Amino acid sequence: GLMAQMATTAAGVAVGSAVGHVMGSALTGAFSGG
Amino acid sequence: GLMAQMATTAAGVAVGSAVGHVMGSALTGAFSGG
Amino acid sequence: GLMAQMATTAAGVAVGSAVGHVMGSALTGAFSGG
Amino acid sequence: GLMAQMATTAAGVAVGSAVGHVMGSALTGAFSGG
Amino acid sequence: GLMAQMATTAAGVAVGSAVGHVMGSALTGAFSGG
Amino acid sequence: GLMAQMATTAAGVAVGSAVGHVMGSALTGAFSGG
Amino acid sequence: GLMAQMATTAAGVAVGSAVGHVMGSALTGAFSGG
Amino acid sequence: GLMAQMATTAAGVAVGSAVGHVMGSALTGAFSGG
Amino acid sequence: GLMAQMATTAAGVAVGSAVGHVMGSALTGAFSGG
Amino acid sequence: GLMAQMATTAAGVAVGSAVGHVMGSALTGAFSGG
Amino acid sequence: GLMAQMATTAAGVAVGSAVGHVMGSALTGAFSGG
Amino acid sequence: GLMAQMATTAAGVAVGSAVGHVMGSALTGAFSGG
Amino acid sequence: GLMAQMATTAAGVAVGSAVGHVMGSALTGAFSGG
Amino acid sequence: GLMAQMATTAAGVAVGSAVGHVMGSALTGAFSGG
Amino acid sequence: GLMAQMATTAAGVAVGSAVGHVMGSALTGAFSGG
Amino acid sequence: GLMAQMATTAAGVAVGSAVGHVMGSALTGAFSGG
Amino acid sequence: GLMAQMATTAAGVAVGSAVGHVMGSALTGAFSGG
Amino acid sequence: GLMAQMATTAAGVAVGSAVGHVMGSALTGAFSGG
């Protein structure tokens, strides 16, 4: 099979932009205030 | 089969924009205030 | 079969915009105030 | 006087998030399909 | 005087979230299909 | 006077995040499909 | 007066993140598809 | 099968932009305030 | 007066991150597809 | 099979830009405030 | 007056990171596809 | 199979840009504030 | 007056990192595909 | 199989640019504030 | 007045890093594909 | 199999640029503030 | 007045690193593909 | 098999540039502030 992700961005003026892609992966994260 | 995600963004002026894609993945997260 | 997600955004002026896609994934999250 | 904007975000798992702030500015944008 | 805007967001799992703030500004936008 | 913008972000797992700040500025943008 | 912008980001795992600050500036942009 | 990720970005003026790709990987992260 | 911009970033694992600051400047950009 | 990641960036003026690619790898990170 | 920009970055593992500062400058750029 | 990563960057003016590629590797990192 | 820019970077493992500073300068650039 | 990484960069004016490639390697790093 | 730029970098392992400083200068560049 | 890394850089004016390649190697590093 | 630029770099292992400083100078460059 | 690394650099004016290649080697480094 075909598994694809696409993301096209166009702008006259851009201040903040971000693109993130995740495919077939294991992500684990922990956060502690103190 | 075909599994696809698409996201097109166009703007004259953009201040805050973000695109996120997740496919076939395991994500685990924990948050603690203190 | 075909499983697709699409999202097109166009604007003259954009201040806050975000796009999120989730497909065939396991997401677990925990939040603690203190 | 005091003019302030605040935005706090916390999440166990976040896929798409964006924050935009505009203060005392002139923004002009134009969009054309073709 | 005091002019403030606040926005707090907390979630165990978040897919799409966006925050936008506008204060004392001039925004002009135009859109054309073709 | 005091003019301040703040934005705090915390997450166990983050895929797409973006922060944009505009203060006392002139932004002009134009977009053309073809 | 005091004009300040702040942005703090913390995450266990981050894939896409971006921070943009604009203060007292003139930005002009033009986009053409063809 | 074919597994592909694409991300095209075009802008007249860009201040903050970031692109992140993850495929078939194991990511583990830990955060401690103090 | 005091004009300051701050941006602090901390993460266990970071794939894509970018920080941009603009203060008291003139930016002009043009884009042409062909 | 074919596993490919692509990222094209074009801009008249760019201040902050970053591209990150991860494929078939093990990443482990730890952060301590003090 | 005092005009300062600060940017601190800390991470256990970093793949793509970039920091850009612009102050009191004139930037002009042009892009042509062909 | 074929495993490839590509990243093309073009800009009239670039201040901060960085490209990072990781393939089939083991990365371990530790951070301590004090 | 005082005009200063600071950028501190610390990481256990870093693959791609870049820092750019511009102050009181004139930058002009042109790009042509062919 | 074929495992390749490519990165092409072109700019009229470039202040900060860096390219990093990692393939089939073991990287270990430790950081201590004091 | 005082005009200073600082950039400190520390890492356990660094593959690609670059630092660029521009102050009170005129930079002109031209690029041609063919 | 074929394992190749390529990196081409072209610019009218370049202030800071660096290219790093790692293939099939063991890298270990330690950092101590004091 | 005082105009100073500083750049300190420390790393356990460094593969690619470069530092560039420009102050009060005129730089002109031209590039031609053929 | 074939294991090759290539890096081509061309610029009208270059101030800081460095190229580093590592293949099939063991690198160990230690750093101490005092």
Side-chain angles (χ1 to χ4, degrees):
Chain A
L2 165 54
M3 304 195 347
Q5 330 195 286
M6 279 146 296
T8 77
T9 300
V13 171
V15 171
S17 178
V19 175
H21 290 272
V22 165
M23 161 160 335
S25 72
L27 265 65
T28 310
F31 187 91
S32 293
Chain B
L2 165 54
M3 304 195 347
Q5 330 195 286
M6 279 146 296
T8 77
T9 300
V13 171
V15 171
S17 178
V19 175
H21 290 272
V22 165
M23 161 160 335
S25 72
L27 265 65
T28 310
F31 187 91
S32 293
Chain C
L2 165 54
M3 304 195 347
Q5 330 195 286
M6 279 146 296
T8 77
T9 300
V13 171
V15 171
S17 178
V19 175
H21 290 272
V22 165
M23 161 160 335
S25 72
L27 265 65
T28 310
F31 187 91
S32 293
Chain D
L2 165 54
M3 304 195 347
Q5 330 195 286
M6 279 146 296
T8 77
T9 300
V13 171
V15 171
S17 178
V19 175
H21 290 272
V22 165
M23 161 160 335
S25 72
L27 265 65
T28 310
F31 187 91
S32 293
Chain E
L2 165 54
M3 304 195 347
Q5 330 195 286
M6 279 146 296
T8 77
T9 300
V13 171
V15 171
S17 178
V19 175
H21 290 272
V22 165
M23 161 160 335
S25 72
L27 265 65
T28 310
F31 187 91
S32 293
Chain F
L2 165 54
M3 304 195 347
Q5 330 195 286
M6 279 146 296
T8 77
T9 300
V13 171
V15 171
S17 178
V19 175
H21 290 272
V22 165
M23 161 160 335
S25 72
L27 265 65
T28 310
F31 187 91
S32 293
Chain G
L2 165 54
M3 304 195 347
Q5 330 195 286
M6 279 146 296
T8 77
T9 300
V13 171
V15 171
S17 178
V19 175
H21 290 272
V22 165
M23 161 160 335
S25 72
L27 265 65
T28 310
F31 187 91
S32 293
Chain H
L2 165 54
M3 304 195 347
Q5 330 195 286
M6 279 146 296
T8 77
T9 300
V13 171
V15 171
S17 178
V19 175
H21 290 272
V22 165
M23 161 160 335
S25 72
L27 265 65
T28 310
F31 187 91
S32 293
Chain I
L2 165 54
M3 304 195 347
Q5 330 195 286
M6 279 146 296
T8 77
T9 300
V13 171
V15 171
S17 178
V19 175
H21 290 272
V22 165
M23 161 160 335
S25 72
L27 265 65
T28 310
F31 187 91
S32 293
Chain J
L2 165 54
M3 304 195 347
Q5 330 195 286
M6 279 146 296
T8 77
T9 300
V13 171
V15 171
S17 178
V19 175
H21 290 272
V22 165
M23 161 160 335
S25 72
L27 265 65
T28 310
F31 187 91
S32 293
Chain K
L2 165 54
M3 304 195 347
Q5 330 195 286
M6 279 146 296
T8 77
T9 300
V13 171
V15 171
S17 178
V19 175
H21 290 272
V22 165
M23 161 160 335
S25 72
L27 265 65
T28 310
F31 187 91
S32 293
Chain L
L2 165 54
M3 304 195 347
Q5 330 195 286
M6 279 146 296
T8 77
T9 300
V13 171
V15 171
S17 178
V19 175
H21 290 272
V22 165
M23 161 160 335
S25 72
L27 265 65
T28 310
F31 187 91
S32 293
Chain M
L2 165 54
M3 304 195 347
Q5 330 195 286
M6 279 146 296
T8 77
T9 300
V13 171
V15 171
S17 178
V19 175
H21 290 272
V22 165
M23 161 160 335
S25 72
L27 265 65
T28 310
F31 187 91
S32 293
Chain N
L2 165 54
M3 304 195 347
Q5 330 195 286
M6 279 146 296
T8 77
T9 300
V13 171
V15 171
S17 178
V19 175
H21 290 272
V22 165
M23 161 160 335
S25 72
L27 265 65
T28 310
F31 187 91
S32 293
Chain O
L2 165 54
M3 304 195 347
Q5 330 195 286
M6 279 146 296
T8 77
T9 300
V13 171
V15 171
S17 178
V19 175
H21 290 272
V22 165
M23 161 160 335
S25 72
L27 265 65
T28 310
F31 187 91
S32 293
Chain P
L2 165 54
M3 304 195 347
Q5 330 195 286
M6 279 146 296
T8 77
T9 300
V13 171
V15 171
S17 178
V19 175
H21 290 272
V22 165
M23 161 160 335
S25 72
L27 265 65
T28 310
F31 187 91
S32 293
Chain Q
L2 165 54
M3 304 195 347
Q5 330 195 286
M6 279 146 296
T8 77
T9 300
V13 171
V15 171
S17 178
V19 175
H21 290 272
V22 165
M23 161 160 335
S25 72
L27 265 65
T28 310
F31 187 91
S32 293
Chain R
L2 165 54
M3 304 195 347
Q5 330 195 286
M6 279 146 296
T8 77
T9 300
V13 171
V15 171
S17 178
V19 175
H21 290 272
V22 165
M23 161 160 335
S25 72
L27 265 65
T28 310
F31 187 91
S32 293

